Design an enzyme around this catalytic site. Structure first.
Site, PDB file in Angstrom:
ATOM      1  N   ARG A   1      24.057 -90.851  94.559  1.00 19.09           N
ATOM      2  CA  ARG A   1      23.984 -89.846  95.615  1.00 19.09           C
ATOM      3  C   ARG A   1      25.228 -89.862  96.501  1.00 19.09           C
ATOM      4  O   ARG A   1      25.603 -88.839  97.070  1.00 19.09           O
ATOM      5  CB  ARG A   1      22.735 -90.062  96.469  1.00 19.09           C
ATOM      6  CG  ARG A   1      22.625 -91.463  97.046  1.00 19.09           C
ATOM      7  CD  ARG A   1      21.375 -91.632  97.892  1.00 19.09           C
ATOM      8  NE  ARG A   1      21.172 -93.031  98.256  1.00 19.09           N
ATOM      9  CZ  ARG A   1      20.481 -93.897  97.522  1.00 19.09           C
ATOM     10  NH1 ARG A   1      19.920 -93.506  96.386  1.00 19.09           N
ATOM     11  NH2 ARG A   1      20.350 -95.153  97.924  1.00 19.09           N
ATOM     12  N   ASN A   2      25.861 -91.028  96.618  1.00 19.19           N
ATOM     13  CA  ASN A   2      27.065 -91.164  97.429  1.00 19.19           C
ATOM     14  C   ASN A   2      28.336 -91.186  96.588  1.00 19.19           C
ATOM     15  O   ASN A   2      29.387 -91.646  97.037  1.00 19.19           O
ATOM     16  CB  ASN A   2      26.984 -92.420  98.296  1.00 19.19           C
ATOM     17  CG  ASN A   2      25.972 -92.285  99.416  1.00 19.19           C
ATOM     18  OD1 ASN A   2      25.961 -91.289 100.139  1.00 19.19           O
ATOM     19  ND2 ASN A   2      25.110 -93.285  99.560  1.00 19.19           N
TER      20      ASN A   2
ATOM     21  N   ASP B   1      31.063 -91.848 102.035  1.00 22.83           N
ATOM     22  CA  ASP B   1      30.390 -92.638 103.069  1.00 22.83           C
ATOM     23  C   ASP B   1      30.776 -94.114 103.046  1.00 22.83           C
ATOM     24  O   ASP B   1      29.938 -94.984 103.282  1.00 22.83           O
ATOM     25  CB  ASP B   1      28.870 -92.503 102.941  1.00 22.83           C
ATOM     26  CG  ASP B   1      28.358 -91.176 103.467  1.00 22.83           C
ATOM     27  OD1 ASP B   1      29.035 -90.574 104.326  1.00 22.83           O
ATOM     28  OD2 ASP B   1      27.274 -90.738 103.024  1.00 22.83           O
TER      29      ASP B   1
ATOM     30  N   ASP C   1      25.649 -98.171 101.066  1.00 18.26           N
ATOM     31  CA  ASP C   1      24.687 -97.656 100.139  1.00 18.26           C
ATOM     32  C   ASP C   1      25.367 -97.118  98.914  1.00 18.26           C
ATOM     33  O   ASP C   1      25.420 -95.940  98.727  1.00 18.26           O
ATOM     34  CB  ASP C   1      23.945 -96.526 100.835  1.00 18.26           C
ATOM     35  CG  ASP C   1      22.818 -95.970 100.026  1.00 18.26           C
ATOM     36  OD1 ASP C   1      22.162 -96.727  99.316  1.00 18.26           O
ATOM     37  OD2 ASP C   1      22.563 -94.768 100.118  1.00 18.26           O
TER      38      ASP C   1
HETATM   39  C1  LIG Z   1      19.299 -81.807 102.856  1.00 18.52           C
HETATM   40  C2  LIG Z   1      20.773 -81.721 102.603  1.00 18.52           C
HETATM   41  C3  LIG Z   1      21.172 -82.220 101.236  1.00 18.52           C
HETATM   42  O1  LIG Z   1      20.674 -81.788 100.205  1.00 18.52           O
HETATM   43  N1  LIG Z   1      22.117 -83.187 101.244  1.00 18.52           N
HETATM   44  C4  LIG Z   1      23.501 -83.063 101.510  1.00 18.52           C
HETATM   45  C5  LIG Z   1      24.293 -84.190 101.345  1.00 18.52           C
HETATM   46  C6  LIG Z   1      25.650 -84.123 101.580  1.00 18.52           C
HETATM   47  C7  LIG Z   1      26.262 -82.944 101.979  1.00 18.52           C
HETATM   48  C8  LIG Z   1      27.750 -82.900 102.222  1.00 18.52           C
HETATM   49  C9  LIG Z   1      28.392 -84.139 101.594  1.00 18.52           C
HETATM   50  N2  LIG Z   1      29.871 -84.154 101.709  1.00 18.52           N
HETATM   51  C10 LIG Z   1      30.457 -84.947 102.671  1.00 18.52           C
HETATM   52  O2  LIG Z   1      29.760 -85.481 103.517  1.00 18.52           O
HETATM   53  N3  LIG Z   1      31.821 -85.179 102.614  1.00 18.52           N
HETATM   54  C11 LIG Z   1      32.367 -86.260 103.371  1.00 18.52           C
HETATM   55  C12 LIG Z   1      32.736 -86.077 104.695  1.00 18.52           C
HETATM   56  C13 LIG Z   1      33.272 -87.128 105.422  1.00 18.52           C
HETATM   57  O3  LIG Z   1      33.643 -86.949 106.729  1.00 18.52           O
HETATM   58  C14 LIG Z   1      34.280 -88.036 107.393  1.00 18.52           C
HETATM   59  C15 LIG Z   1      33.447 -88.372 104.835  1.00 18.52           C
HETATM   60  C16 LIG Z   1      33.077 -88.556 103.513  1.00 18.52           C
HETATM   61  O4  LIG Z   1      33.248 -89.786 102.933  1.00 18.52           O
HETATM   62  C17 LIG Z   1      33.841 -90.814 103.721  1.00 18.52           C
HETATM   63  C18 LIG Z   1      32.541 -87.506 102.784  1.00 18.52           C
HETATM   64  C19 LIG Z   1      32.754 -84.412 101.792  1.00 18.52           C
HETATM   65  C20 LIG Z   1      32.049 -83.516 100.827  1.00 18.52           C
HETATM   66  C21 LIG Z   1      32.781 -82.725  99.856  1.00 18.52           C
HETATM   67  N4  LIG Z   1      32.130 -81.940  99.004  1.00 18.52           N
HETATM   68  C22 LIG Z   1      30.786 -81.933  99.073  1.00 18.52           C
HETATM   69  N5  LIG Z   1      30.122 -81.125  98.210  1.00 18.52           N
HETATM   70  C23 LIG Z   1      28.797 -81.156  97.789  1.00 18.52           C
HETATM   71  C24 LIG Z   1      28.060 -82.355  97.814  1.00 18.52           C
HETATM   72  C25 LIG Z   1      26.741 -82.390  97.412  1.00 18.52           C
HETATM   73  C26 LIG Z   1      26.113 -81.233  96.988  1.00 18.52           C
HETATM   74  C27 LIG Z   1      26.804 -80.039  96.962  1.00 18.52           C
HETATM   75  C28 LIG Z   1      28.156 -79.981  97.380  1.00 18.52           C
HETATM   76  N6  LIG Z   1      28.867 -78.765  97.355  1.00 18.52           N
HETATM   77  C29 LIG Z   1      28.387 -77.550  97.681  1.00 18.52           C
HETATM   78  O5  LIG Z   1      27.310 -77.394  98.265  1.00 18.52           O
HETATM   79  C30 LIG Z   1      29.269 -76.414  97.324  1.00 18.52           C
HETATM   80  C31 LIG Z   1      28.790 -75.295  96.841  1.00 18.52           C
HETATM   81  N7  LIG Z   1      30.035 -82.626  99.949  1.00 18.52           N
HETATM   82  C32 LIG Z   1      30.656 -83.426 100.823  1.00 18.52           C
HETATM   83  C33 LIG Z   1      25.463 -81.823 102.126  1.00 18.52           C
HETATM   84  C34 LIG Z   1      24.099 -81.873 101.896  1.00 18.52           C
END
Ligand SMILES: */C=C/C(=O)Nc1ccc(CCN2C(=O)N(c3cc(OC)cc(OC)c3)Cc3cnc(Nc4ccccc4NC(=O)C=C)nc32)cc1
Length: 293
Positions: free
Chosen positions: A156-157, A170, A152
């Protein structure tokens, strides 16, 4: 079952992680902000803000293998400046923690929206927006070269760091069985099906070329400053629009060159779409020639 094989090159002792609170607004509380002490072997008195993915409370025996696969996938793919990189893991004596890079400024959709004109935040120059496109293209080029097909690809990603570095997320997941479920909306109430290439949508065929289609939709997201593709258009009508060869309109502040790039990404014939290598080269040239004023 918390007996997992240990890869010492990636292992971090659990007492080096200071777990913070869930990222984003807080729905996916399976992923949290955290602080890693001495992540790097050089001087372990340095703290690094990181993101930690763990298993939910009600974790299935396969959600475990899901996370593990994602972790191993990231190991194999390797590191790049424009993807969310693996930093370490906690696999022994407790629940599985996968440690990845942290993005303070959220996803690209949020980032763009919060920087639209009307306490403002920032306004992006024309060079800034094309630079965003370049970074995502460069990330996707690397992923493509590692034979990785994103499921996807969308704003957003794409995540944004403190230094405004675009990082693709992702990209280590698996093609979910079959049932993609075209009516399922995202948390922001959009249909991910609107990012899908026709051959992926109608014939379930996923190639690197279908990702280029998605990059085209992402390009449209960037220059509409986080705009929503096909507002008010249900799944059934989207199919009709696609079968008729309809294409999204040119964004207002978007140059003709860039709109041509989108249209090229949206070529009906997958073989005729540009490659990410081409896109990186073009976007590189465009950034250099795009005004900062
Ligand atoms: C209803 C919930 C909502 O609004 N959505 C939501 C979407 C994503 C996240 C966390 C996303 N995220 C993440 O998943 N990361 C990640 C982890 C792994 O593990 C294997 C693999 C990835 O790619 C292969 C990615 C890392 C990461 C790092 N930083 C953030 N920060 C962030 C993203 C979006 C909005 C806000 C923030 N930051 C804060 O909230 C800080 C104040 N996200 C991820 C949560 C909610």
């Amino acid at each position: 079952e918390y007996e997992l094989p240990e890869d010492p090159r990636w292992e971090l002792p659990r007492d080096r992680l200071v777990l913070g609170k869930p990222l984003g607004e807080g729905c996916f509380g399976q992923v949290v902000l955290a602080e890693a002490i001495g992540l790097d072997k050089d001087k372990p008195n340095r703290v690094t803000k990181v993101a930690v993915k763990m298993l939910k409370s009600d974790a299935t025996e396969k959600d475990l293998s899901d996370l593990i696969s994602e972790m191993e996938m990231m190991k194999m793919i390797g590191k790049h400046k424009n993807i969310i990189n693996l930093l370490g893991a906690c696999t022994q004596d407790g629940p599985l923690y996968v440690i990845v890079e942290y993005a303070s400024k959220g996803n690209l959709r949020e980032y763009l929206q919060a920087r639209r004109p009307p306490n403002p935040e920032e306004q992006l120059s024309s060079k800034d927006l094309v630079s965003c496109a370049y970074q995502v293209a460069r990330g996707m080029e690397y992923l493509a070269s590692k034979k990785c097909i994103h499921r996807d690809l969308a704003a957003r990603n794409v995540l944004v760091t403190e230094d405004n570095v675009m990082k693709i997320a992702d990209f280590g997941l698996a093609r979910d069985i079959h049932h993609i479920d075209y009516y399922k909306k995202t948390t922001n109430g959009r249909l991910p099906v609107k990012w899908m290439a026709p051959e992926a949508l109608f014939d379930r065929i996923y190639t690197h070329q279908s990702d280029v289609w998605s990059f085209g939709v992402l390009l449209w997201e960037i220059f509409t400053l986080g705009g929503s593709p096909y507002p008010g258009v249900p799944v059934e009508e989207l199919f009709k629009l696609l079968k008729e060869g309809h294409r999204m309109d040119k964004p207002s502040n978007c140059t003709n060159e860039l709109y041509m790039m989108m249209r090229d990404c949206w070529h009906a014939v997958p073989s005729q779409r540009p490659t990410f290598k081409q896109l990186v080269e073009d976007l590189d040239r465009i950034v250099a020639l795009t005004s900062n004023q």
